[PDB]
Amino acid sequence: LTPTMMLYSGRSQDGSHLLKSGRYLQQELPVRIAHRIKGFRSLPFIIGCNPTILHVHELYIRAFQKLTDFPPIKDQADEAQYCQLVRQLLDDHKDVVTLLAEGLRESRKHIEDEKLVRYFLDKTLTSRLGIRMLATHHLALHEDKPDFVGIICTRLSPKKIIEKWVDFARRLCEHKYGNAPRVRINGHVAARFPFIPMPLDYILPELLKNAMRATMESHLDTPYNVPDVVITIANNDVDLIIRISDRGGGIAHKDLDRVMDYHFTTAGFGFGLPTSRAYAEYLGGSLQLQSLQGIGTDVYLRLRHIDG
Amino acid sequence: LTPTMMLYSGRSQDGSHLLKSGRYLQQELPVRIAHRIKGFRSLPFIIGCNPTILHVHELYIRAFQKLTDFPPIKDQADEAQYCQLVRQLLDDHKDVVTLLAEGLRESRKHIEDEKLVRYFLDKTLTSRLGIRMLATHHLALHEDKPDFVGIICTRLSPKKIIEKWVDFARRLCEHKYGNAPRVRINGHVAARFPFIPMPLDYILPELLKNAMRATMESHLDTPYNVPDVVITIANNDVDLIIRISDRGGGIAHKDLDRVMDYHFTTAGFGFGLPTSRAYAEYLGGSLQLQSLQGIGTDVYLRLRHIDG
Ligand SMILES: Nc1ncnc2c1ncn2[C@@H]1O[C@H](COP(=O)(O)OP(=O)(O)NP(=O)(O)O)[C@@H](O)[C@H]1O
Ligand SMILES: Nc1ncnc2c1ncn2[C@@H]1O[C@H](COP(=O)(O)OP(=O)(O)NP(=O)(O)O)[C@@H](O)[C@H]1O
Ligand SMILES: O=C(O)c1sc2cc(Cl)ccc2c1Cl
Ligand SMILES: O=C(O)c1sc2cc(Cl)ccc2c1Cl
Ligand SMILES: [K+]
Ligand SMILES: [K+]
Ligand SMILES: [Mg+2]
Ligand SMILES: [Mg+2]
C-alpha cells in the first residue's frame, strides 16, 4: 500500500481480480481528480488565468468527466475498454509537470504569499504520482513479467535500478560535456526485496543529473578526468537509504535556502529537488542534503520498505 | 493621524496647505490602490472570476489609472480639478462593500481555506476606510465648519453622535416592527474631545440596528412595550468606550463562534459585526461581545483617543 491508497497484489484464476481492481480505480480516481480540480479553482486568480495553467485545469476536468461518464464495470469486456481510457489519460497527461512548471514560472511572481505555489505544487504533483501509480498498477496487472505483481517488484535490486539510471544520466552528461563522472556503488550491493520502482525512476535520474552537472561544471579545466560519484546503499528492516555523494564543489551558502524551491536553478525549470523531496515524503520517506562548500554534496534519499 | 496615514490639520493663509494635502494624496493613494489590486489578483481563481468581483477589481484598476494619469499638482487650479476627480471616485466606489458582499456570497463556498475571505475582506475594507478618510479629509479641508478641521472634529460629543444614530436606527426599526426600543445614555454624557466621527458613523448604526432587531424579535408578544437599550459612555485619557447593552435575549451558544464571520446572518449580508470589528481594530481599537444567553448582549466598542 501507499498513502491512503492500496496497490492490490491479488491474483485470481477467473480474472476476477482485474474486475476488482478496475472497480477500485473507478471509486478512487474521480475523487482524487476532483480534489485537484478544487486545487486549480483555489489558485490565485492571476495564476489561474495563465493559459497553460488553464489548459491543465481543463485536462483535469476532462479526466474527471471521462471517468465519471464510464459505465459501471461489470465484466472483462468493460474492464478491457476501461484500460483503453486509462492508457489514454496516462498519455494525455504525461507532460503535466512541464506544463505546470511553464504556466507557473512567470505568474507566481505576481502574488505575495510564495508559500502558496510550493504547497500547490507539492500537493498537486504528489497526488498525481499517486494517481499514476494506481493507474499504471492496474494496467500492469494484465502483464506477465517475472518478479512483478502489477508495478510491485517482488525482488528489486537497488544496485540494478541505480545502474540503469546511472547509464541514462551519463549519456546525457557525456552529450553535453564530452565526458561524465564514473559512478561507484557500495554498501548493500546484493540487496534484494519487494519494492515499487516507479518513485525511484522519477527520483534517481534527477539526483544523478544534479551530481554530474555539478561535477562537470566544477572541473572545466579537466573534463577528461573528474572525480567519481559515489553511491552507498543501506538496506535495513525499516527503510532503504541511497546516499549519492559527489565532489562537485557543494551547494553554496547563498543558494542553500533556495535550491529546494520550485523554479530555482543556477543553470530545466529547476524542479528536480523539490519534486524529488515531495515524492519521497509522500511515500513516507525523505530527501536530505549535506553541502560541503568547496568540496561536494551528499544527498540522502530514504524510502520506507513495503509492509507485509 | 491614523494607521501609516496622517490627517493633516494644518491651516494656511495662502492656501498652500491644500496644495500640500493634494500632493500627499497623490503620493499615498495610488500605492494603497495598487496593494488592493494585488489583493484582487491573488483571490482564489473561482472567486476572482465572479462577475461582481471582476467589476470591483476593474473599478480599482480604473481608480489607479485615473490618479496616476492626473498631472503633478502645481497650483490651486490643479488642486481644484483634483478635488473633482476625488469626488468622482468616492462616488463611483460608494457601493463597493455591497458589491464585494454580493460577489463573495456564493463563490466563497467553493474554496477550502475559509480564513482566506475573512483576511481579504478585513484587509480590503479597512484599507478602503483609510482611503476614504484621507480623500474625504482633503475635500473637507476646503470647508469652513466650526469645530472641524477637515474630517477631524475638535470637540466631538459622543452623546450627540450616538443620539444621531439612535434616531436613524429607531426609524428603521419602527418602520419594520411598528415600534423601537428607547435608548438611554449614561456615563460621561458631557464628554467633549477631538475625534474623527467617520468610523463612529460606520459602526454605531450597525451595532444599534443589531440591538434593536434582537430586542424586537425577542418581544413579539409585546411590540408596544420592549426593554430599553442602554448605552454607557466612558471617556478616559487612553480611549473612548461605548457599551451598548440590550435585553434582546443574547447571542445563542451555537451562533457565538459564527456571528463575527462575514456572510453569517440569522435574518443585509451579515456584515455589520465583522466590518465593525475590522474598522475598530484598524484604528487601534476593538469590538468585544458579551452574550448573556436568555437575557441580552453587551457590546463594547473601544476607540483610541487622538494623539496631540
Ligand atoms: N549535487 C549538487 N551539487 C551542486 N549543486 C547542486 C547539486 N544538486 C542541486 N544543486 C544546485 O541546486 C539547484 C537546483 O537543483 P534542481 O532542483 O534539481 O534544479 P535544476 O538541476 O537546476 N534543473 P532541473 O533539470 O529542473 O532539475 C541547481 O541548479 C544547482 O544550483
Ligand atoms: N445584540 C444582538 N443580540 C442578538 N443577536 C445579535 C446581536 N448582534 C448581532 N447578533 C446576531 O449576530 C448576527 C450577525 O450580526 P451582523 O454581523 O451585524 O449581521 P446582520 O445583522 O445579520 N446583517 P447586517 O445588516 O449585514 O449587519 C445577527 O444576524 C444575529 O443573529
Ligand atoms: O495528471 C496525470 O498525470 C494523470 S494520469 C491519469 C490517469 C487516469 Cl485513469 C485518471 C487521471 C489521471 C491524471 Cl489527472
Ligand atoms: O473603494 C473606495 O471606496 C474608494 S474611494 C476612493 C477615492 C479616491 Cl481619490 C481614490 C480611490 C478610492 C477608492 Cl479605491
Ligand atoms: K530547484
Ligand atoms: K456576521
Ligand atoms: Mg536538477
Ligand atoms: Mg447587523
Side-chain angles (χ1 to χ4, degrees):
Chain A
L1 66 112
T2 46
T4 333
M5 181 175 69
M6 60 197 55
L7 296 194
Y8 283 156
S9 73
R11 76 210 77 271
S12 249
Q13 67 289 357
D14 40 18
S16 64
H17 75 281
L18 298 170
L19 301 190
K20 201 214 181 301
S21 176
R23 283 165 36 227
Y24 177 65
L25 263 65
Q26 273 304 84
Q27 82 173 66
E28 201 61 41
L29 297 183
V31 161
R32 299 183 172 204
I33 300 170
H35 289 152
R36 294 304 95 231
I37 293 170
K38 174 167 192 133
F40 282 95
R41 293 177 177 187
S42 289
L43 274 172
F45 177 72
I46 197 162
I47 300 176
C49 279
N50 172 272
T52 305
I53 298 299
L54 273 176
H55 177 257
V56 182
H57 188 170
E58 303 180 3
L59 283 181
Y60 270 64
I61 291 168
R62 166 175 166 239
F64 180 84
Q65 290 172 336
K66 289 183 177 178
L67 287 201
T68 57
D69 285 342
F70 197 91
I73 296 173
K74 287 98 54 191
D75 54 38
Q76 178 60 65
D78 290 338
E79 191 276 337
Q81 254 12 88
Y82 189 66
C83 289
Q84 287 302 97
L85 170 62
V86 172
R87 289 203 149 84
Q88 182 185 83
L89 293 175
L90 280 169
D91 184 70
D92 287 347
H93 288 236
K94 69 185 157 62
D95 295 319
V96 159
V97 179
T98 295
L99 296 164
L100 292 173
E102 241 310 291
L104 281 171
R105 203 187 76 265
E106 273 312 299
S107 56
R108 66 175 297 175
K109 298 165 175 175
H110 298 37
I111 78 179
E112 57 297 66
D113 186 12
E114 193 214 26
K115 286 199 238 341
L116 252 180
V117 169
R118 170 82 73 83
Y119 185 80
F120 172 81
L121 283 172
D122 286 350
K123 190 72 180 196
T124 303
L125 299 184
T126 60
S127 291
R128 174 172 181 278
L129 175 64
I131 290 159
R132 297 186 71 88
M133 287 173 66
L134 184 57
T136 304
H137 184 64
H138 179 79
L139 295 174
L141 285 177
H142 289 275
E143 292 177 355
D144 226 73
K145 301 191 296 185
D147 300 2
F148 277 89
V149 181
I151 60 172
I152 304 151
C153 182
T154 65
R155 49 183 299 269
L156 187 135
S157 161
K159 174 171 161 61
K160 299 210 171 290
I161 190 160
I162 289 168
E163 289 175 345
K164 175 189 185 179
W165 291 111
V166 161
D167 293 350
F168 171 86
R170 288 194 83 244
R171 258 169 242 128
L172 290 181
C173 187
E174 251 158 2
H175 183 252
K176 184 177 186 182
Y177 300 97
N179 191 28
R182 279 195 192 280
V183 178
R184 300 198 316 267
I185 305 172
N186 60 44
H188 293 141
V189 291
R192 268 186 160 76
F193 44 82
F195 212 79
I196 306 172
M198 185 170 315
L200 285 173
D201 291 330
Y202 275 75
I203 297 168
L204 291 178
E206 293 307 324
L207 301 183
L208 291 169
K209 289 193 288 185
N210 286 352
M212 290 182 189
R213 212 258 285 190
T215 304
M216 300 315 290
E217 308 270 31
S218 62
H219 292 79
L220 292 167
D221 296 325
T222 55
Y224 42 71
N225 186 10
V226 304
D228 292 346
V229 169
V230 178
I231 299 181
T232 299
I233 298 163
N235 177 34
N236 58 80
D237 285 334
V238 176
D239 57 3
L240 163 70
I241 304 119
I242 295 168
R243 177 184 62 194
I244 301 174
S245 300
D246 65 57
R247 288 297 179 111
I251 297 167
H253 284 99
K254 69 193 194 65
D255 294 333
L256 243 195
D257 291 324
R258 302 234 272 161
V259 294
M260 304 308 299
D261 288 351
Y262 292 98
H263 297 105
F264 176 87
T265 176
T266 58
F269 290 96
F271 263 48
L273 285 176
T275 302
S276 296
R277 181 164 79 183
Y279 294 157
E281 296 190 355
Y282 175 70
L283 300 175
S286 64
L287 182 66
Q288 294 174 358
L289 309 169
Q290 288 291 340
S291 185
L292 297 82
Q293 291 83 355
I295 292 293
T297 302
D298 295 327
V299 177
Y300 296 77
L301 175 61
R302 298 188 164 84
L303 295 174
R304 287 204 158 101
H305 276 294
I306 287 180
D307 208 283
Chain B
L1 66 112
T2 46
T4 333
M5 181 175 69
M6 60 197 55
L7 296 194
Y8 283 156
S9 73
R11 76 210 77 271
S12 249
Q13 67 289 357
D14 40 18
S16 64
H17 75 281
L18 298 170
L19 301 190
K20 201 214 181 301
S21 176
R23 283 165 36 227
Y24 177 65
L25 263 65
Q26 273 304 84
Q27 82 173 66
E28 201 61 41
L29 297 183
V31 161
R32 299 183 172 204
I33 300 170
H35 289 152
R36 294 304 95 231
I37 293 170
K38 174 167 192 133
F40 282 95
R41 293 177 177 187
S42 289
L43 274 172
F45 177 72
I46 197 162
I47 300 176
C49 279
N50 172 272
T52 305
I53 298 299
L54 273 176
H55 177 257
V56 182
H57 188 170
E58 303 180 3
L59 283 181
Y60 270 64
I61 291 168
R62 166 175 166 239
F64 180 84
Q65 290 172 336
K66 289 183 177 178
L67 287 201
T68 57
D69 285 342
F70 197 91
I73 296 173
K74 287 98 54 191
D75 54 38
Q76 178 60 65
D78 290 338
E79 191 276 337
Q81 254 12 88
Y82 189 66
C83 289
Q84 287 302 97
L85 170 62
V86 172
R87 289 203 149 84
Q88 182 185 83
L89 293 175
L90 280 169
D91 184 70
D92 287 347
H93 288 236
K94 69 185 157 62
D95 295 319
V96 159
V97 179
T98 295
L99 296 164
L100 292 173
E102 241 310 291
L104 281 171
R105 203 187 76 265
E106 273 312 299
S107 56
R108 66 175 297 175
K109 298 165 175 175
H110 298 37
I111 78 179
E112 57 297 66
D113 186 12
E114 193 214 26
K115 286 199 238 341
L116 252 180
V117 169
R118 170 82 73 83
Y119 185 80
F120 172 81
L121 283 172
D122 286 350
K123 190 72 180 196
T124 303
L125 299 184
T126 60
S127 291
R128 174 172 181 278
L129 175 64
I131 290 159
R132 297 186 71 88
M133 287 173 66
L134 184 57
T136 304
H137 184 64
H138 179 79
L139 295 174
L141 285 177
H142 289 275
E143 292 177 355
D144 226 73
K145 301 191 296 185
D147 300 2
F148 277 89
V149 181
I151 60 172
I152 304 151
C153 182
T154 65
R155 49 183 299 269
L156 187 135
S157 161
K159 174 171 161 61
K160 299 210 171 290
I161 190 160
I162 289 168
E163 289 175 345
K164 175 189 185 179
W165 291 111
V166 161
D167 293 350
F168 171 86
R170 288 194 83 244
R171 258 169 242 128
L172 290 181
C173 187
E174 251 158 2
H175 183 252
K176 184 177 186 182
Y177 300 97
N179 191 28
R182 279 195 192 280
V183 178
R184 300 198 316 267
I185 305 172
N186 60 44
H188 293 141
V189 291
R192 268 186 160 76
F193 44 82
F195 212 79
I196 306 172
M198 185 170 315
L200 285 173
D201 291 330
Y202 275 75
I203 297 168
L204 291 178
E206 293 307 324
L207 301 183
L208 291 169
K209 289 193 288 185
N210 286 352
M212 290 182 189
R213 212 258 285 190
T215 304
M216 300 315 290
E217 308 270 31
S218 62
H219 292 79
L220 292 167
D221 296 325
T222 55
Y224 42 71
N225 186 10
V226 304
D228 292 346
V229 169
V230 178
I231 299 181
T232 299
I233 298 163
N235 177 34
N236 58 80
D237 285 334
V238 176
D239 57 3
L240 163 70
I241 304 119
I242 295 168
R243 177 184 62 194
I244 301 174
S245 300
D246 65 57
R247 288 297 179 111
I251 297 167
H253 284 99
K254 69 193 194 65
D255 294 333
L256 243 195
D257 291 324
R258 302 234 272 161
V259 294
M260 304 308 299
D261 288 351
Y262 292 98
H263 297 105
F264 176 87
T265 176
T266 58
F269 290 96
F271 263 48
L273 285 176
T275 302
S276 296
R277 181 164 79 183
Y279 294 157
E281 296 190 355
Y282 175 70
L283 300 175
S286 64
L287 182 66
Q288 294 174 358
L289 309 169
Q290 288 291 340
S291 185
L292 297 82
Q293 291 83 355
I295 292 293
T297 302
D298 295 327
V299 177
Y300 296 77
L301 175 61
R302 298 188 164 84
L303 295 174
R304 287 204 158 101
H305 276 294
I306 287 180
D307 208 283

